[PDB]
Structure 1
């Protein structure tokens, strides 16, 4: 009858451990841009992992950093989903 106290958590990190996260001063951070765009288009009809997987893809493909500083130039990013969910999650019906 008991349920683990750590169960039913989900963490959608913008990036993987040890790595930085990119933010565009004019457009906002990459992860949020992608998250919102996909949610606007599929928030109601897709399962949460499907959404975040597509978010992963969007950040990974559509984005590449630009900077006069070469250290931060042409860099890439992949987000990081941590799921302790026990069920599928749909935001509708």
Structure 2
């Protein structure tokens, strides 16, 4: 009969624990850029994990930092999906 209280949560973090997350003042944060881009073209036909996996790929490949401070130069980012979902999620049909 019962269902766990922590069930059916999903967390799409912009980065992995312990790490920074990057943001362009001109274009917005990497994670949001990628999330919106992919939702625009596949929001209605892809499952939520497929969407966020592609988001992971795009943030990982398409982005690299530039700073004059070498400590922050040419650094990378990977997002992080935590799923307590019990079903597949489509936003359509």
What SS does the corresponding residue of 2:92 show, helix, strand or coil? coil
What SS does the corresponding residue of 1:37 show, helix, strand or coil? helix
What SS does the corresponding residue of 1:18 show, helix, strand or coil? coil
TM-score (norm 1): 0.99
Let me know the Cα RMSD of the aligned residues.
Answer: 0.3
Number of matched pairs: 93
Spell out, residue by residue over 1:22-46, the C-alpha distance to the aligned partner (whole angstroms, 9 max, x if none): 0001000000000000000000000
Tell me how far apart the structure 1 counterparts of residues 22 and 70 of structure 2 sit (CA, whole Å). Answer: 15
What SS does the corresponding residue of 1:81 show, helix, strand or coil? strand
Moved over 6 A (4+): none
1:71 Cα offset (Å)? 1.0
Query: Which blocks of at least 5 consecutive residues in structure 1 are unaligned?
Result: none
What SS does the corresponding residue of 1:56 show, helix, strand or coil? helix
Spell out, residue by residue over 1:56-86, the C-alpha distance to the aligned partner (whole angstroms, 9 max, x if none): 0000000000111111110000000000000
